[PDB]
Amino acid sequence: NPLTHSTPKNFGIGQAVQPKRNLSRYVKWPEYVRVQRQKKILSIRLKVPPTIAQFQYTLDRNTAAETFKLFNKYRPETAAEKKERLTKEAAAVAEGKSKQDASPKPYAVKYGLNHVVALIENKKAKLVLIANDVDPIELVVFLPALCKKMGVPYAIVKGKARLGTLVNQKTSAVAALTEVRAEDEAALAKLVSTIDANFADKYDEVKKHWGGGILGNKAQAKMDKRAKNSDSA
Amino acid sequence: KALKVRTSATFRLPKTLKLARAPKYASKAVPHYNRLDSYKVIEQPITSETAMKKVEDGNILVFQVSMKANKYQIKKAVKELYEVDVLKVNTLVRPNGTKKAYVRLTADYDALDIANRIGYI
Amino acid sequence: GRVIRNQRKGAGSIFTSHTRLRQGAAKLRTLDYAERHGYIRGIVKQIVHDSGRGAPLAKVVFRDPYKYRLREEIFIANEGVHTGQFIYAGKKASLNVGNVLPLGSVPEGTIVSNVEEKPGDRGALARASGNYVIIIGHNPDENKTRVRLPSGAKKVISSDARGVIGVIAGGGRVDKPLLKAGRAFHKYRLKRNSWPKTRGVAMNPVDHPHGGGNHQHIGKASTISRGAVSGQKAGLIAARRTGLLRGSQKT
Amino acid sequence: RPRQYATVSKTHKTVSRAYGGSRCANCVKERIIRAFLIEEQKIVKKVVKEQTEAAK
Amino acid sequence: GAYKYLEELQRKKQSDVLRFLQRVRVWEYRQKNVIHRAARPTRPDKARRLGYKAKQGFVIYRVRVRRG
RNA sequence: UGACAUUGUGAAGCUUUACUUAUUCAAUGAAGCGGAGCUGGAAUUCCACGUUCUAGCAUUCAAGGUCCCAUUCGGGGCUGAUCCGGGUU
RNA sequence: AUGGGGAAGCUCCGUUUCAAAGGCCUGAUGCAGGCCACCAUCGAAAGGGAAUCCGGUUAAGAUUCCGGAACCUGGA
C-alpha cells in the first residue's frame, strides 16, 4: 500500500500504446471460413423460393426430442448384434432346421434416400423424417411435396447428424418408420396430429411463401433510420 | 459459451502434431560400406625428386589422394594407416587431376624413417 | 514501317524510370482510426532532396498507436515545414501549415497540397513543386467538397479526403532557364530516359509518320484523331484548336 | 570498422553516462531539460484544466 | 428411387428453386479455386449416370474455364 | 456504339428514384464499423465524449480496485478499457 | 519458383502480392513456455567484407612452404 501506486493509463487517440483488445471481429479468416460465412449470408439475403424456404421450419426442441426418443428404440441392429443373430441362426438352421421365424421379426427405422422414397411412393411409410441441411438440397426438396401428395406424414427434422447416430452411421438424409409395434402405436399416434400439424397442415401455406431478404445488421439499422424521420414527413 | 478471444487480426495455421516416419520397409536393403575409408583416401605416395627432398629435409610425406577427400580425412587416414601424428595437411589438385597432399608429421616422427618403412626410400 | 519511338516506350526495357536514389514513395499516413477520428502528432526529423523530384521530401516520425514502433512517413514538404516542427495529422488537428486535415474540416479558400483524390489512398493531387489546391466550397449534404486544381479544373471529392495545408514548396523552379544541354541531360538522367528527342520530321518515313520527303515537312494534318490507333498518334492528339492563343483565355 | 567493435572492451565503446555511446553530452543535457520542463508543464496544464473544470 | 426425381427436376434449369441454387453455387465456385477437389458431386444422379460410384478411389474435381 | 447473357430485388409515376448479395475499385499485419447506452454542454433536439508554447519519454496479458485458490516465492477472473451484431473498412 | 491467376500447350504474368505461407531463444519433440510477423532463391574473383607480416628457400612454388613473430572466428 505505501509503495504501490495507481497510475491510470490514458488510452486516448494520441496517448499511450493501445492495449491488446479483442480483435475477433476483424480476424482475417481463411478462405474456406470466409466462403462458409458468406455463403450463409448470401443464401439468407437472396429471396429463397418457397420449396427451399420450407426447410427453415424444423421441429421444436420438444417434438424433436420426442421423435428421436421414439426412433431410438427402433435404431437398427449394429454389426455386432447382427453377427450374434447370425450365430443364433447358424445354430437354428443345423438344429431346428428353420430359417424364417427363427428370429423375431425386425422392427427398425428404415433409412436411405432411395429406400425411403420408394416406401413413400408405395405408401408403406407410416412416418418420415427429413434432414434439413443436406448439401445438395435437391435430394430432398421434392420429398415434402411427395409426402403431401402420397398422404404420408413428414417432418423436416433438425440435423442429419442425429439421423446418423440413429441409424449407426455418420450421416443419413432421411429416416422412416413403416412398421411400428402395438406398444408404441399410441406414441406414434400422438407424434402425428402434431408433426403433420406444424408441417403437413401448413404445407399449402408455405408453398405460397418465399423467404430470405434478411439484410445485414448495418443495413437493417440504416433501413430503420430511413423509415423513421420519413414516416412522419 | 463465448468464442475464443483473439488479440491479433492475423489468422495463422495452428501447429498440429507432426509424426515421424516408421516405414514398413527399409529404404535400401543394406547400408553402404564406408565409401572413403583409409585405403581409399590414401592411394599411393609420390617419389619424384622434389618429393624425396621434402621427405628427407622437411619431414613431409607426399601422398596421392582421391579428389573426394579433405584435410580431416587425410589426417585420420594417415594416423590410421601409419601410426604417426600429423602436424598439418596441405592439399592441392595436380594439373593431371588428382589430389596431392603434403602431410607434415609432428617433430617426434621421422618422415625418412616411415617412408622406407612403407617401402619407398 | 517500323514500331515508332512512342510505340516503343510502353514495353519498358530502357524506358523505365531511374529509381535508385529516390528516398521512397511520398505518401501520407494510412487512414487509421486515430487519424480519421481525432489527430496524431508527428515530428519532422529531416527534409531531404528526392532525385528526379523538384519538391523536397519531409520525413515525419509518427508513434504507432498499436505497437511500440515509430512509423516514419515520407511526406512532401510544404513551404514552411522545417525540422523540429510538429505535424498534426487528422480531423481534429488545428489549421496550421504542414498539418493534414480532411477537406471537410477546413474553411473555404484554404490552400492545401498533396490532396487525396478519394478518401483512403495517400495523396494524388498537387504534389509537384509550387503547386496547390484551393478549397472552393463544401457540400455537407452529400459529404463532398469542391476544389480548384493546379490545372484550373474544378473537382468534387469526398470531404474525408485528406490534404496537407500550404504549398508544395520548391516553387518557381521552372523560372530559371537551363542554359546548357547538360543541365537538361542531368535533369532527365534521373527521369525515365525521355531526352534528347529526335523530330519525327527528321526521321525516315519508316520510323515516324512525319518522316520522309525531300523537304522536312509533315505532309498531312498533324492534328491526329482521338480514335486513331496506336502508332498513328504522333503530333497533336485530339487537338480542339491549334496555333497561338492570341487572347485572354482566362487567367 | 564495424566488426572490430566486437573485439574491444566495453570501455572503448561507451561513455560513463546515460546515452553513453549513442548521443552527445549536449544532446543528453537538452533532452533531460526538455523532459523535466515539459513534464512540469504537463502537471501545470493538468492543474489548470482541473481548476477550470469547476468553472461551470 | 430418388434418382428419377433428381434427373427430372434437374431438367428445369429455369425453375425458381434451381435458379436460386445456381445463383448461390456459381458464387461459391467463383470464390473457390479454378481447380479444386469437390468432396461429393453436386449432381449425384448425373454422376451415377456418367459412371460415378460412391466408393473409395472415385474422385470428383471441380473446374472452371474461361468462356468465349 | 447497340443488342443479347452475368443481371437479381422495389416503389413512384417509357422516365425517376431506391436495396445489398452478384460484379467492379482501393487499403490495412483486415484495429476500433454499425446500433445503443452513459457524462457534461448547448437545447425533446444537436454536439463532444482524455493528447497543441518545446527535436524528451510512452513496451513487458497495465498500475490501481475487487473476487477466488493457495498466498509461494505464485496462479486465475472481472473491472480498469460501456453493451449488442462477428458485415475488415 | 511457391500461393495464385492466364494459356489448347510448350509456358506466361507475378515477387509479396485475393495464402491457413515459419524460425529464434530457451528449461527440458510437446515444450516452463515465450518471442517474433518479417517472406524461397540467384545476382559482383573491380561494390560491402572477420583476421599475416618479415627473412630464407626452388630447375619451375609462395602474403600458401621453412624459421620466427601476430591476429580473427567458433568452441570448450
Q: Could you tell me the three cell numbers for D22? A: 549513442
Only one residue has cell 535400401, namely: B28
Protein CB footprint (7 Å) on chain F nucleotides: 6-9, 19-23, 26-36, 40-41, 49-59, 61-65, 80-81, 85-89
DSSP string, chain B: --PPP-S-SB-------------SS-SSSSPPP-TT-HHHHEEEE--SHHHHHHHHHS-EEEEEE-TT--HHHHHHHHHHHS---EEEEEEEE-TTS-EEEEEEE-TTS-HHHHHHHHT--
d(CA D30, CA D18): 13
Which residue in the set A12, A14, A17 is minimally distant from C66, CB to CB? A17
How far in angstroms lies nucleotide G1's C1' from the CA of residue E35? Answer: 20
**Partners of C133 in the beta sheet?**
C112
Contact A28 B10 (CB under 8 A): yes
Helices (H), chain C: 5-8, 33-37, 181-189
Who's near B120: CB < 8 A, 6+ residues apart?
B45, B47
Helices (runs of H) and strands (runs of E) counted in chain A:
11, 4
Technique used by the depositors:
cryo-EM
CA distance E51 to A129: 30
The HSE-up count of residue C234 (CA atoms within 13 Å, CB side) is 22
Q: For residue C243, what are the contacts with CB-CB under 8 A and spacing of at least 6? A: none
Could you tell me which residues are beta bridge partners of residue C111?
Answer: C134
Evaluated on CA atoms A192, A195, A197, A200, the torsion sign reads negative
- Asked if A17 lies within 8 A of C41 by C-beta distance, the reply is no
Element (H, E) at A163: helix A160-166
| Cell 408455405, residue located | A206
Give the C-alpha separation, C19 to C15, whole Å.
12
Phi, psi (rounded to 5 degrees) for C225? -70, 155
> How many helices, marked H, and strands, marked E, lie in chain C?
3, 12
> Which of A186, A118, A113, A107 shows the shortest CA–CA distance to A152?
A118
Q: Phi/psi of residue C121, each to 5°?
A: -80, -170
Resolution (A): 3.1
User: Which of the 8 DSSP states describes residue A104?
Assistant: P
CA dihedral over C99, C105, C110, C113, signed as positive or negative: positive
**Continuous segment of H or E residues that includes residue C154:** strand C154-158
DSSP state letter for A96: T
Q: How many CA atoms lie within 13 A of A164 on its CB side?
A: 9
Which residue is the nearest neighbor of F57, CA to C1'? Answer: D35
* C173 CB neighbour count, 10 Å cutoff: 12
Could you identify the residue written with the cell 520522309?
A: C212
Q: What angle do CA A142, A146, A152 make, to 5 degrees?
A: 135
Q: Which of E27, E55, E18, E50 is nearest to E40 (CA)?
A: E55
Strand G, nucleotides < 7 Å from a protein CB: these are 4-8, 18-22, 29-30, 37, 49-51, 58-60, 64-66, 71-73
Beta strands in E1-68 (DSSP E): 35-37, 61-63
Amino acid at D1: R
SS3 content of chain C, % helix, strand, coil (to 5): 10, 25, 65
Question: What residues of chain A, 9 to 28, have a C-beta less than 8 Å from chain C?
Answer: 12-14, 17-18
Rounded to whole angstroms, the Cα distance separating B40 from B62 reads: 16
- Determine contact, residues C115/C168, Cβ cutoff 8 Å: no
Residue A93's SS3 state is helix
CB-based contacts of A166, cutoff 8 Å, min separation 6? A68, A71, A72, A75, A109, A111, A172, A175
Residue C181: how many other CB atoms lie within 10 Å: 10
Residue to substitute from A39, A138, A140, A206, interface E, most E β-carbons within 10 A: A138
Q: What is the C-alpha to C-alpha distance for residues C62 and C84, in angstroms, rounded to an integer? A: 13
Query: What are the distances in angstroms from CA D33 to CA C42, C105, C130, C144, C213?
Result: 21, 36, 39, 46, 79
Name the residue among E20, E40, E42 with its Cβ closest to that of A52: E20
Concatenate the DSSP letters of all residues of A109-153 into one string: -EE-HHHHHHHHHTT--SEEEEES--SSGGGTSHHHHHHHHHT--
Q: What's the CA gap between D13 and A232, in Å, rounded? A: 78
- Is B2 an interface residue toward A (CB < 8 Å)? no
Contact E43, E8 (CB under 8 A): no
Please answer whether residues C108 and C126 qualify as being in contact, where contact means their C-beta atoms are separated by less than 8 angstroms: no
| Nucleotide at minimal C1' distance from the B18 CA | G29
C-alpha cell at A2: 505505501
DSSP letter assigned to residue C215: S
For A67, the enclosing helix (H) or strand (E) is helix A63-72
Of C148, C164, C9, nearest in space to C96 by CA: C164
Cα E30 vs. chain centroid, distance in angstroms?
A: 14
Q: Given a contact as 3+ CB pairs under 8 Å, which chains touch D?
A: none
Nearest CA in chain A to B13: A30
Cα separation, B15 vs D8, in Å, equals 43
DSSP code of residue A101: T
Of the candidates A155, A169, A158, A170, the one whose C-alpha atom is nearest the C-alpha of residue A125 is A155
**HSE, side-chain direction, 13 A CA sphere, residue C58:** 28
Q: Estimate the share of chain D in helix, then strand, then coil, as percent rounded to the nearest 5.
A: 70, 0, 30
B101, B92, B94: which is closest to B60 by C-alpha?
A: B101
Whether A146 has its CB under 8 Å from any CB of chain E: the answer is yes
Measured from the Cβ of residue C159, the count of other Cβ atoms closer than 10 Å reads 18
CA B76 to chain centre: 8
Going by C-alpha positions, the residue among B99, B50, B46 that lies closest to residue B73 is B99
Torsion of CA C80, C81, C82, C86, to 10 degrees: 130
**C26 is written with which cell numbers?**
511520398
Chains that touch E (3 or more CB pairs under 8 A): A
On the 0-12 / 13-18 / 19+ scale of CB atoms within 10 A, A107 is: middle
